[PDB]
Write the C-alpha cells for this entry.
Amino acid sequence: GSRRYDSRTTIFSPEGRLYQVEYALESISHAGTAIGIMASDGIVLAAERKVTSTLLEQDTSTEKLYKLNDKIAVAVAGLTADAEILINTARIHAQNYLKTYNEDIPVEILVRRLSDIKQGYTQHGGLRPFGVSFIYAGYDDRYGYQLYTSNPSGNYTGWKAISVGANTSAAQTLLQMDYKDDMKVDDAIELALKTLSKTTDSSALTYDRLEFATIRKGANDGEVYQKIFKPQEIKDILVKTGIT
Amino acid sequence: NNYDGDTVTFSPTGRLFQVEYALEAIKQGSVTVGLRSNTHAVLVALKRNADELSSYQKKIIKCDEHMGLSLAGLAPDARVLSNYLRQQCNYSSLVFNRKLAVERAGHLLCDKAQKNTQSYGGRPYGVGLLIIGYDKSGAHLLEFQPSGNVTELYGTAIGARSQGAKTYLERTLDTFIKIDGNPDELIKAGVEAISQSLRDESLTVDNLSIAIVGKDTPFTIYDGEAVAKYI
Amino acid sequence: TQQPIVTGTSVISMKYDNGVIIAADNLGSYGSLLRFNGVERLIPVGDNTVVGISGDISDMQHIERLLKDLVTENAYDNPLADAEEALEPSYIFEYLATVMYQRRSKMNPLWNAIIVAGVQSNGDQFLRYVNLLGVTYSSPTLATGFGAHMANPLLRKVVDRESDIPKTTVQVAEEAIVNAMRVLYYRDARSSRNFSLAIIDKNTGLTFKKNLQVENMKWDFAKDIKGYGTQKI
Amino acid sequence: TTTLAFKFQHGVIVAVDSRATAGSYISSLRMNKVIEINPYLLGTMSGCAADCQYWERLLAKECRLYYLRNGERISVSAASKLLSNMMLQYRGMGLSMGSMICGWDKKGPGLYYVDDNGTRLSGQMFSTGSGNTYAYGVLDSNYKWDLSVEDALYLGKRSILAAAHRDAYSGGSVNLYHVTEDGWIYHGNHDVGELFWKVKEEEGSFNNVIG
Amino acid sequence: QFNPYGDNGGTILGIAGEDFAVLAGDTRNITDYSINSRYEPKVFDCGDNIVMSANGFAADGDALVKRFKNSVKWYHFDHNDKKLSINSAARNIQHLLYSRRFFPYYVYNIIAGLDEDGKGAVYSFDPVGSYQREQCRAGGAAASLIMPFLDNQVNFKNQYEPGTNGKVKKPLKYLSVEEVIKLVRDSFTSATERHIQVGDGLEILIVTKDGVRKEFYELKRD
Amino acid sequence: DRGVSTFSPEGRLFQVEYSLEAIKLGSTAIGIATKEGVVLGVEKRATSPLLESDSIEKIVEIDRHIGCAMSGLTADARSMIEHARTAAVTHNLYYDEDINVESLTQSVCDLALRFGELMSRPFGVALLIAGHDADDGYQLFHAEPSGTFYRYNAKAIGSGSEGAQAELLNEWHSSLTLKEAELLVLKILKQVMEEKLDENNAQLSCITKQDGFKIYDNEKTAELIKELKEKEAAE
Amino acid sequence: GYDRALSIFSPDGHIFQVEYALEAVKRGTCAVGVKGKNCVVLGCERRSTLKLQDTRITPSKVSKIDSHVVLSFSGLNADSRILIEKARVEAQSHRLTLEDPVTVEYLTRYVAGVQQRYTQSGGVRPFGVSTLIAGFDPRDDEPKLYQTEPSGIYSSWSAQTIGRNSKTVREFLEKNYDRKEPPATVEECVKLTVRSLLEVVQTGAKNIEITVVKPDSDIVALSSEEINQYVTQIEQEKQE
Amino acid sequence: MDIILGIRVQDSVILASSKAVTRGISVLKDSDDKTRQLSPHTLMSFAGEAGDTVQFAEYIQANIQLYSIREDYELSPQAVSSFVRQELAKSIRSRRPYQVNVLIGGYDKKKNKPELYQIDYLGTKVELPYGAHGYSGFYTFSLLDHHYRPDMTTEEGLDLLKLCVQELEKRMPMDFKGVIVKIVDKDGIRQVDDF
Ligand SMILES: *[C@@]([C])([C][O])[C@](*)(=O)[C]([C]C1=[C][C]=[C][C]=[C]1)[N]C(=O)[C]([C]C1=[C][N]C2=C1[C]=[C][C]=[C]2)[N]C(=O)[C]([C])[N]C(=O)C1=C([C])C2=C([C]1)[C]=[C][C]=[C]2
Ligand SMILES: [Mg+2]
C-alpha cells in the first residue's frame, strides 16, 4: 500500500535527534543573515536579501521583515512561502487575543503559540516541518522590549542580541564582542549593519541588498512606533554609519 | 518472498502468501474432527494445554440452540468469528422468527473473511472452523478456511496430524452416515476418528472435548467426566 | 409524521379447519372521493401466504415492493428456495412487524393496518395482525378498520373460540366472509361493491379470486319509507 | 415524599418516608428512598423514582472506581459534585431528582443537597419532597448541635411523622439511618399507622385527632 | 399528529410465596371499545426459572420481553452458562428501561421467580425503570381494584384478632400455592365484573424449584 | 517497511511474538492457586537505592474479589487495569453481583488484538489475574498480548520464568495451604532474583473469599521471609 | 488522518523509538531533585554555550503546574511545553470536578499516562522528555518527588537526577544522601543540590538554577547571588 | 438567585450579595455565598437561573486560574471582564444559553485603581461606580445617585451600602435573608463578617 512511500518525517534518529528538524536547520543556514539587537530605548531588526537583481522592484518587495501587529515584528530566515503561512496565523492569533481580553497580546504568548505550531509538525501528522527561523522583535508593558527566536524544532529562547540564517557563528561572535547592556538604538543600528558588512558573502553591502526596521519608544510620549525602512532611508543610514 | 509483505499483493504465480501463512497457523493448531449422520452432527476436539499446571484451551463454541463450531488456530479470531455468527443467528431469529440455515451461515463467514484478504491495512483470519448444525434441511457439517473457502462435508478434520482422521472418515463414510437415531455410536465414530491423529499422547478426561446437535437435541458441549464414558 | 392521503378500507379474515380466508375491496379513496376503483390490496407472497393491507396506498405499494424484494433475496444462494427454505407466513409477518415498529419508533410510520394470512410448513394456520404502531395480535377472526366493528361480530358467531376452528368448513367460512363484505358495503361510506378474496388451504393450496361483487342485496323496503317522522306522502 | 437529613455532634441523621404515588393512587406502601452507596455514604431520593435510582446507583459506580484508583474513600463534597455534574449533562431534558448526599469523611460529617437543576448546597439540615415544610417546622424548633444519638433519631423520626400526617403524598413507613465515623447504621422500618398512635399517647401531641 | 403510543388494556398480578411465586394476567387484548383477541398471551417464560409480563402498550411490551430474553441468552454466552439470578435480571431490566428515558417503553413490568435462597420473589417496575422487590403487586388497567384486596387478604391489613378490639393484629401466616391461586382467581373474577378491559381468559404461571407450570381459567367474555 | 498486523511464514503475528520478548525482559511475577486462596508475588527490582521501593506498584487491585500482578513494560498495564476495573464495576452496576474471574480476564484479553493501522501496537506486558467467585472458586489466569489466556494452578512470568515454572512443576500439589503457598512464592522468587530477597525488593499479596484481595505489609512479609530461612536451615 | 505506527516492537523485544527518545533526554541539560525533611529542592543546569541571552524572558527550566506542584525536565524543550500545558489543564480540571487540588502522585500518573499514550498511538512519536515532578499534597507536610520517562513508567525518589552526565551526579547522590537522616533544613537541602550539580556543571555562575518548594504552596526561586554564596562556601570547605 | 450589589469607592470595590436560596416554597439555605475569587485581586458575584450560576462562575474561575499559572501573572480586571463578556455573548446564541448575570469587582495593581464591571447574561458590559442586577437597582440607584462620591472611603461605602440594604428590606416583597459583603482592594479580598 501507501506505507512504501512514507518518508516518516516525525521520528528520532538512533542518537535522539529529529532528522527533518536538523535538515531544515541546514536549509536555513544557507538563507540570508538576519540580525536582531535589543537596546534600552528600542529594538533593531536588520536582514540581508539574497543575491538580488537590478530588475527587482525593491520598494514594493518584502522577503525578510514582516509586521505581526503594531507592537510586534519578525525577521525571517528560510523558505519565504513557509514563513507567510505562519505569519498569517500569528496575525490572527494576535487579533483573537485582542478581541478576547481587549488588550494587545504579550510578546511571549504570541511567540509560544507559533513555536507550538512548529512543534506539532515534528511530533505528529507525518508532514515536513516549516523550514523557517524567526527573530521576534516586540514590546509590551510587562517586560518592555523583547527579542526572541524560534526554529523548526519549535524551541524558542530570549535574547539581548541574536542572528539567524547564514554565518550565525561568525555573526554571534562579533555581536558578543561589541554589545553592551547600556547600549542605545542608534548604537545598535550601527552594530547590526557593521556585523552584516563583515559576515556577508557579497562583495560589498549596499542599500538594495538590505531590509531594515526599528521598534522605538521614540514616538510622541508613552507609546511605541514601528519603522520599516524605505530603500532611500537604508541608503542614508549606510552613509551615516560610514559603510558606503 | 517480495510479495508476502501484505494481503493486498499477488505473487507472480497468482498466490496470496499472507493468506497461505494464515492457513499455516491452522496446521500448527490442535486437531479437531467433524462428522454427521442424517439425524445428528458431532464435533470432537483434542484440547491443548500449556503445561501440567495449566488448563486445557477450549476448542468448541456455541453459536445458537441449533448451531456451533470447533476451532483450530488463533483462538481470539475464532471468538470474533463466532461472535459474528451469534449475532447473525440472532438477527435471523429476532427479525424473521427464523433459525439461520447452516449453509447461509457458511456464506456469511466466507464473505466476512474475504473482505480481510482484499483490503490494505488489515489481515486474514488465522483460524479454521468446523461448523455443525441442524436446520430445516436436516443435519449439516461445514469446513471454514480463512481464505474464504467454505465447504459442506459428510465428515472432516483440521489441525495438526488431521490427515489421519480424514483418511479414516473417508473409509468409514458409508458406515457413520447411516448411524441414525443413535448419538452415542456417532460420537464413538468421531472419537475413533480423532484417535488416528494422536501420537505419544492419548485421550484423557480433561483432554477430550465433544459436542453434538440433532433432531431433538440442542447444541450441547461435553467436557470433564461427561466424556469419560467415551474414553 | 404524516397524514394518509389515498386510502384503503377494511381487510377481513378468519381461520377454518384446513386453512385461512382473507378478503378486501378494490377501492382507493381520496378522502370522501372514491378516486381509484381497480386497486388490489391482497398481495400474495409465494403459494402459502397472502398479505392484506389497509390504510395509506403509497405506503402499501412500498410494502408490496419490500415483499417482492424479500422473495428475491431469499432465493439467493438457496437451493431449497422452493421447498424447505421457502418463505413462511411467520417469517413474512415478523419482518413486517419489525419494520412497522422501527418506523413508529422513528416517528415516521407506515400508515397501515396489515393482516398476514397463510399456512405454515407443518399445516398449521397462520393469522396475525400488525399496524402503524407495531401492535400485534392473533385471533381466529381478524379485521381492520370498520371490519373490526362490523365483520368480527359476524365472523365470531361462526368461530367464537379456538375449538370451533376444526368444526368450520371452507364453504361455511367463505359464506361468512362474503356476507360480511356485503354488510360493510351497506354501512361503510368508504367501501366498494368490487372486492378480492383469497383462500390458503393446506391441501388445495392458494386460490386467489378477483373481480368478485356484492350480490343478493336488500333495497326493496326503501320504497315504503317516507319522510323523517310525520310525512305520509 | 418527605425526606430529611441533619448534621449534629454525633454525626448525621437521615430519615425518609416510604410512600409512592401515581396521581392520587398510592402505588407503593413501602419504597426504599435511601441508597447505600458505601459503608460511609448515603443518598436520599425525592422526585422521579427511576431518575433517583438510576443516577445514584451510577454515582456509586463512580464513587467505587474512585476508591480503586486512589486507594481511598471519596469525600462527600466530591461525591455530591460528581452527581451535580451528571445532572448538568441532561440540562433541561426533564429529569426530576432531589437528593441529599450524607456521609462521614476526613473533614468530619458531611451533608450536601443536590437537585436536577445542578444545584449543590452544603449545610447542616435539609429536607426535600412534597412534605418538607411540615418536617422543617419540627426540625427548626427542636434542633440542637448538642443532641444525643437517641434524641436525634427521634427528632428525624418525629419530623417525618409530622409530614406523613398532613401531606397526602407522604406516609407508609419511616426508614431511619445514623451515620458515624465507623460508617452508617440502619435504625429500622417504622410503620406510620402504629407510630402515630404511639407518639400521640406518649407525647400528648395530635390532640385534635381522636383515638 | 402521529401518536406513537397506544393502550392495549389488560391486567397482571404477581404474588410471592414462601418457596414459590405466581405471575398471572388476563388474555384479552383491546383498543378503545373493541376486542382484538380473546387469547393473546401476556406472561412469558424467559428462561432461568424467570417469568415476565410487560403490561400496557403491547408493542413496547413485546419489544422489552424480546430484549430481556435476548439479554438472558447473551448472559449465558458471556459468563459461562451461569444462571441469571432474579435480582440480577431485575437490575438488568432497569437499564433496558432507562435506555429509553426520553422515549419510554409504555409498560408496567413485573417479573417473578425464586431468589438465591430458594424463596419466592416478585420484582415490579415503572415505565422509566424504578424497581423494587415486593411480596404482592397488581399492574395494569384494574390494578387499583385488585391491590387493596391483596393488602387485606394477603398482608391482613386492618385485620385484628377478635376480643382484643384493635390491640392485637392478625398474625402474618404464610400462604400455600393453592391458597394464592384462589386469591388470584377471585381477584380477576372481581376485576372482570367491574372493568370492561378485563375478561375472556386468565393465564397463571407458577414458579417453583421444579420449574415453571401453567394454569388457564376462563373469564367472562362480555 | 512492513505491516503491523503481518503474519510470518510460520503462521505467527510478528508483533505479538516480539512483544513476548519484551515480557521476558520484565521483572519476575509468580502466582500460586490453592483451595484456601490464591497468592500473588512480584520482584520489584529498583534501578537505584534512592528510588523509594514502596512506590513500585506491580501488584494491583481490580475488584474486592480480583487481584492482578504484572511483568514487562509495566506502563502499558495502566490502561488494561483501568479497563478491568471499569468492566468489573460496570457489571456490578448492570447485574447487581460480582463478575466472574474468567469473564473479567476475557474482557481484558479482548483489548489485546485491537491493534493495526485502535492502538498502534500490542501491549508489551503480561498479567497474572487471580481471584475468586462462587461458580468456579479460586482461580489464576495468565493474560498475554496475543489475546490468549490460560488458567493455571501455578504460573511464573518474567525473566526467571522457565526456571521458576520448572520449580513450580515439582512443588505444587492440590492440598497446599495458604501459608505453604506464601513461603513457596518467596522461595522461588529468592532463587531467580539477582539481588538478595527482602521485604523491600519483593512484595506478596493474596485473595481469599472472606477478606478479599490484600497486599501484604513489609512487616508481615519480613516475618514470612524469616520463617522461610529457618525452615530451610532445619534440614 | 496519518495513522502510521511509528513506535513498534523489534525482533529482540525493544521499542526503538521509545529508546531513542531516552537518547534525546541524555542530550538534555542536567536536572536534579532532592527532598529534605520539610522541603523539596529542584536544581537545573543551564548550558553556558548560549550567552547574550535575556534571562528575564527566556523560558525557565522549572514550571509551576499548580500553586503547590512544580515540574522540571530534561530533553527536548518544545516537547516539554506540551506536557506542561496538558498537566496545567488537568490540574484545573481536577479542582473543578473533585473540589480538591491534585496530589503530586496523581499529577505524575497523568503526565506519565500522556507519555505512555504516545508510545502506542498511530501517527505520533514519543515525547523526548523525562520529568521530575515535586510538591506537597494539600494539607500534608510530607515531601513528594516523582520521576517520569518517555516509556510512561513513573516512580517516587528520595533523590534523583536526569539529563546529561546524570550518571555522575546520581553516583554523588547515592553516597552522600542518607535515608535515615535526610537534609533537615532548607540550607542543607539546597547545599546538597548545588554540590551535586557542581560535579557536572563547569562554572558555578549563571549555570545553576535552584527552586525551593515548601509546604502549603510556598514556592520560591533563588537568585544568582544567593546561589553564588552556596558555590563559594562549598569550594572553601573543599580546599582542605 | 436575586440581589447582588456593587460599589466602587476611592481605593476599593465592595460587593454585597444575598444569602437566600429557595427551592419550591421553602428557603433551603440562608447563608449562601454567591461569589467566586477569580484571582487574588478580582472577585465575581453572580445571580441567575439555578445551577447555571455556579457552573458558569466555576468555569470562569478555572480559566483565569489556568491563565495565572501559565503566565505567572494576574490579568487586569478589564481583561477578565472582557473574557467573561465574550463567554456570555458566545453563550446567548447557543442551543441552551447560560442565564447568569455577574458583577466583577477588581483592584488593578498596575493603575492602582478599583474597578467595577456589570455584565448581564446577554453579554452587555458596562464599567460603573455602582451597579446592580435585576430589580435591585430600582430600589437602590436613587440612594446611590444622591449619596455617592468618587472620593468616598471604604467605611463610607459600607454605610451607604447599609442604607441600600435597609431600603431593599423595607420595600421589596422578597425576603433575601440579608447579604454577605466582601471588599476588594490593593491587599486582596476580605469578607466583612459583621453586617
Ligand atoms: C413523594 C411520594 C412524591 O409524591 C416522593 O417524592 C417519592 C420519592 C420516591 C423516590 C424513590 C422511590 C419511590 C418514591 N416520589 C414518587 O413517588 C414519585 C413522584 C412522581 C410521580 N410522578 C412524578 C413524580 C415526580 C416527578 C415527576 C413525575 N412517583 C413516581 O416516580 C411514580 C411515577 N412511580 C410510581 O408510581 C411507581 C413506582 C416508583 C413503582 C411503581 C409505581 C410500581 C412498581 C415499582 C415502582
Ligand atoms: Mg369485563
Summary: Residues E 192, 195-196, 198-199, 220 surround magnesium ion (ligand 2) (CB under 6 Å). The first helix of chain H runs from residue 52 to 71. Residues 1 and 47 of chain H are 5 Å apart (CA to CA).
